[PDB]
Amino acid sequence: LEPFYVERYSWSQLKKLLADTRKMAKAPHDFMFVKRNDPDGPHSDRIYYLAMSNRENTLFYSEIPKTINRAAVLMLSWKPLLDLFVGIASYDYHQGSGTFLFQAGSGIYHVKDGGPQGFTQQPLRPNLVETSCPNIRMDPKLCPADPDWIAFIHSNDIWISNIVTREERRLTYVHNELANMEEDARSAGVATFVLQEEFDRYSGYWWCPKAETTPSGGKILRILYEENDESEVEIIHVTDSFRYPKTGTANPKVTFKMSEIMIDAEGRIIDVIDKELIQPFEILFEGVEYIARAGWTPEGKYAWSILLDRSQTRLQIVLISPELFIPVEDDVMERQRLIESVPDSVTPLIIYEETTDIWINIHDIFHVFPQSHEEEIEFIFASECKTGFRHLYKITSILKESKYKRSSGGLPAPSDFKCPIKEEIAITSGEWEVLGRHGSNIQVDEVRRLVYFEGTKDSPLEHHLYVVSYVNPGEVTRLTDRGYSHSCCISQHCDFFISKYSNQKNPHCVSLYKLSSPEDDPTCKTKEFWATILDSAGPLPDYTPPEIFSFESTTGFTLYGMLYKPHDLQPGKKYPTVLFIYGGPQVQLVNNRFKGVKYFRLNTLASLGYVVVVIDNRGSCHRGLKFEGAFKYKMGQIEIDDQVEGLQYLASRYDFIDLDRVGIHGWSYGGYLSLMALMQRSDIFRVAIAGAPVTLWIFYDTGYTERYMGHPDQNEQGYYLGSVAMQAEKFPSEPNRLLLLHGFLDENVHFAHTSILLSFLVRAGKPYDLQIYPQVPESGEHYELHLLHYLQENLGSRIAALKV
Amino acid sequence: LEPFYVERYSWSQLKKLLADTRKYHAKAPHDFMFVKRNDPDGPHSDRIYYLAMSNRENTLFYSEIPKTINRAAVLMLSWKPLLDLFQIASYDYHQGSGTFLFQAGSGIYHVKDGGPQGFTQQPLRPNLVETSCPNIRMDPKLCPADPDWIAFIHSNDIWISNIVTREERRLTYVHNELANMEEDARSAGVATFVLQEEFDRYSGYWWCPKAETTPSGGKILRILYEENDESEVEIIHVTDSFRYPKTGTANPKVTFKMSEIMIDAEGRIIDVIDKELIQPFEILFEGVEYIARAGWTPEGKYAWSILLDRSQTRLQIVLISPELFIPVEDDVMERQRLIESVPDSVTPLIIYEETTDIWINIHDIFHVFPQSHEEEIEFIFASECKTGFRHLYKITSILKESKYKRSSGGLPAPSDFKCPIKEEIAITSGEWEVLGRHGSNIQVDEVRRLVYFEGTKDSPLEHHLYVVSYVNPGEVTRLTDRGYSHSCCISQHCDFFISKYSNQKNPHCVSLYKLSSPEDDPTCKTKEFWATILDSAGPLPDYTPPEIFSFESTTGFTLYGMLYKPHDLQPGKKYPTVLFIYGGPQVQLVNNRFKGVKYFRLNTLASLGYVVVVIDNRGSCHRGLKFEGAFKYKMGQIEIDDQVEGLQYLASRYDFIDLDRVGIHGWSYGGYLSLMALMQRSDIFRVAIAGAPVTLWIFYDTGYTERYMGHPDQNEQGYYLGSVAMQAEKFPSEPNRLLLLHGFLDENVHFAHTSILLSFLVRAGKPYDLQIYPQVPESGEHYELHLLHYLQENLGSRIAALKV
């Protein structure tokens, strides 16, 4: 077996090869179905969605016909909703009025369609909500109880504004804009860094969905909101500063607050009264670090919240009445009556609690049914804690009076607020998970008593839509067709669903499917193709996809992988190998989806004469909690074994793989593992190429690394062995093997990780190559050019072998 | 001619090689002072105090100068430690009392020796100057009028302290340590960044050398000081804040202040009166931007200052009477009363003014004789503005009353303060310069009416000590021996001089020389070796020194260079050349000094089989102002021509030079020219290694850049052509030719320079290599290791030749 050598292109030649092969907007999303209610008309519903037609992301609509010509395929035409000459990231809507509310760059706008007014046949002019606020307004939301009232964040304080009457008013006075960030670190209604970046919670205030009518003729509106104090949180810089809770250090001091807003009969604000918790957050919510999720029950009786402890091994779903909040009062004497007056039976209600010895994965599945009984709450939740796979559970919890009393003046023990679990039925089960992250959620048909959900049941390589009864869980019907991975949303009316779908050979496609039942059985569901929303681009003419392989690992698990064979493969020749890797939690690289957009250059590597390989090691997602928990306290230690094992599987199966010329490359956690690969297994990996690597886990934030490695004090050995900067001596003492890539202005994986590794590489007397991208297509073009040229000169070409 | 290729060592072998050649390898005695013993029975005439080292702290030593020597033998002066080790970079001294003052770590200490109290025979214990000041005290100075009083700087304000009574007091209230430096950017008695970095002025206050006695039996002590406001100056951050005046942008607002301190008969402070100039600085000193130097006349009658304009083409010497300062008064009537109280005859006295079409070079030479006439002042100054070479000039200026009167209410016209010149005599002349920087200065013997000075009269490759009369200047006697470059100081008594000397073959020695006259003529001076202070290490066996060469350039100047011939030079073989370079203003690499300490590694390159070349192109110092003025407005445009001309001279003279394997390397301005070399002349230079280079003149400071390039608006093309980051597309599209080296925390040539270059190299599609030193001997050893390997792999070795 002779060694294949890649063509030794010059720098200018390689650049021209990439500019030619290089020569992709956001697919329709955030769908919403509105019924026409016109017996005489041809359409049943109108759908609204956000999409990109190099254009602005904007609102569109399409008409859903009552019947279709089944010999033909219906292409829905995209009608623009807005009359334009930046982008809309998201939008709010209110069914009873037809009111849209959205943000577009610097402005908060509104229009009306599909309400009691009716349906437009032409683009609508966006109506600016006028303001006196100097700076940018963020996170706008319609009040569900009254669509004339919006809310938004301005300079870390909550504001409200009436779109009809032009009235505007600040609700919180927690921050001053002229004051600097070091002295003033408080905020209201805003999710802080860690909750946005590690828990995917972006809003920090929640409109109460119902209005309480006052005897006078007016009404009371409410806003639950978190208030944050980041004073004791660590500060860091980059070429102004921000608050980054480094692992083992302080997270922000949190609490819940209620803004109570009084309006008269004419829609004019009578007064605003900010209210705080009757006892501090630490007392009521013992051991809780993070407010992971929050909201209200359907009728606004209780606020709810999903609460985590610091270690993220204890989760709590807690109901919170508005009666628990009392006015923020100056005078302690006037205040003391307000505390005593609140009854002792009015308590926080921990309606659900669970624990794990691995970690809690937060998700967006949580559905609360209407209250049939004052003493009970009925809801669907998802959890991995019972079986190690995420499954839907229908739960009923009794709302009994707490044994603890506030008049006694004592402090409450852990279990004082626990509610008894009356019922707890498993809706789903098996060796596969329900998806609750990144848009995946449930849709609950309350009439037919069904629940739609996305799952890995048919394969860990494909997401599919399913439906099941929640009253008597039996058969789970798959609604999406096999051979594609899907991403779906279901109409609020539960008679339609849309799927964004693709597989390895075919680019993404968006289609509408009508749902039906047989007359005899409403429980049973069938689907029928209705129309195309976005047609597939067609198979890319010069992109050759990889083959999804697998193998039975010594670890017990099956491990899946992608293999790009070298193009124009000559028999009796062995080829240089490039291992691409991410390998960290919350990500799966290997699945039946189209990879020719993001990972197009893995094809390009195959075209040059490289064997590209991707392998999802233990710790990757969509394989259950036990699979994910394999590296708890052991980040860096187990991942390369999996990668090497899968690499050796392919080597004995395919002798076109040269094991002597193996390179590895990854970004972020992939860069981390690329460095570990060169440190631990230099016998296997000739070159490592680390992009934005994590080199030292004490430099990373609380929410992420404490979940997977615990508090640093309790795991000095795990933090040591998993940090590459504290093991610089283990890198090779020969150059052209280690390449570091990093942006200067990196917000997640700071340049500190790179420069501390560099600082320790200099101590150890070890060689490295470095590239920087100080601020953009230009950087990406240069990265790919430099990367290919590096693999050529130090791995693939004939000079590569002669260099050693 | 066969090409020689260097032996391709591994990274471990090179590290080892460097470690062994380093294994065989301290501040030489400096800041000397001669104190007379005054004992007609003792064996010693003088004791000499000096700062010196032996990896030890730099500390004060003393040595005994004997009245006679054994003239056959050679006397080694033994170093007696003056201080007892603690439970020093500079020092102050009071002759009449024998008081030493110096900062050592956080503390300011004092001891007594060589005064009335006599001479110690053992080390003294340093006495701490006690303080209530929280922060570190800087720049301690003794009041020459009273040795009980010191001044120091603390949190950018001036303080004083009495070392007998322990009274401590704050004189200025200009800065608040609590306030952040965006708000608080004022300082008192401190030289700002540009004046420390580009003019070598470190102190910003000056004690008046005499005390004015009061009627009560007390006295008035005085301190002249500069007050700086840096509010309008540009700020930069480096991984704390910096006030960095970028070229074309604002320098600090400056003024002179005067602090009148009233002391009673028993040495207690009665009062402190802060005093400002009668009219603002801009009115009294029209056109002045920089306070370059300042002090007092010997009798404390006037303050003097050397004032520069922004272009640095006008130098003034002004006398500033203490009568020009009135107290600070917020009250408007009280202040207006004080202006009219000062006579109109009290005026700034511009005793000297010069101009040039090139630039003013600031120096430390300025000597004022005792005032005989109240309307005449006599002084020695040095200047290049007459002949183009720096020479000593004795001047007598007449102190007439100005024509401008403060009562008339107008503003002074630009020459109203200019004194007439009664006499101006050249003490020296010729095609060579007097040295006035980096310790070089004059010593004026006022009895014999001679001036001792250092200069380049015998050669531009050696500094020598000379003496000449200032009354009837004729014969200039060289006092130092040929075949060595010298750095000297003369005893205040003018009967001794010390020389720190070396040459190309011999490491540095420090020897003492006694001065005498023949009995018939005190004007004539002879020298005799007296004793050694520091013995030579001897020629080191490892180190082969370079040969100095010269060539007659086409530009009309002789240009000098150094040549390291390869070690074990083979017949019929051509070797790879490394051109090492600085090539910027104020520096001379090529002279008859020992280069085996700092430039040892140029010898190491010759031991590996490289030809090493150093050439002092036009712009270098020690060749007069015309030679230096070559690149006026044209930095980066002429330097490489001279380098390439000198290299071609050596090539046709020596067949062992391989002109197809030339690399270039340098730091700071040498890194700049290394980039320019690869950009302008890719034909000659294969590889360029640029260390901490200026890539953009608009990012460098005012004091340096505007001196040589003028203001950017006056020189659009020079700034474009001279800034390499503006011309990234002119770099090669072959990799392994450009290596950038930079520290991350550099505060002179900032990382900004490299990061913007990288941005434009990335945007232009050009390859580069990069190494960083995030903060130390480790950094240096890795730099050397990487630099030898980089040249091996990309210029010298066999693989390098194949790699093209």
Ligand SMILES: *C(=O)C(CC)(CC)C(=O)Nc1cccc(CN2CCN(Cc3ccc(Br)cc3)CC2)c1
């Ligand atoms: C890591 O998680 C972060 C954020 C997602 C943060 C540190 C990161 O930095 N991601 C990041 C940085 C730079 C570029 C990308 C996009 N990435 C590049 C690699 N590409 C595969 C590939 C492209 C070209 C060639 Br040649 C080989 C391989 C996938 C997309 C992400």
Ligand SMILES: *C(=O)C(CC)(CC)C(=O)Nc1cccc(CN2CCN(Cc3ccc(Br)cc3)CC2)c1
């Ligand atoms: C430039 O003037 C500055 C400040 C003095 C500011 C940018 C500077 O950075 N100087 C600087 C940086 C780093 C190292 C030095 C010391 N310098 C290195 C080169 N050396 C000669 C040499 C050593 C090794 C080899 Br291999 C070849 C040549 C002289 C000392 C200065």
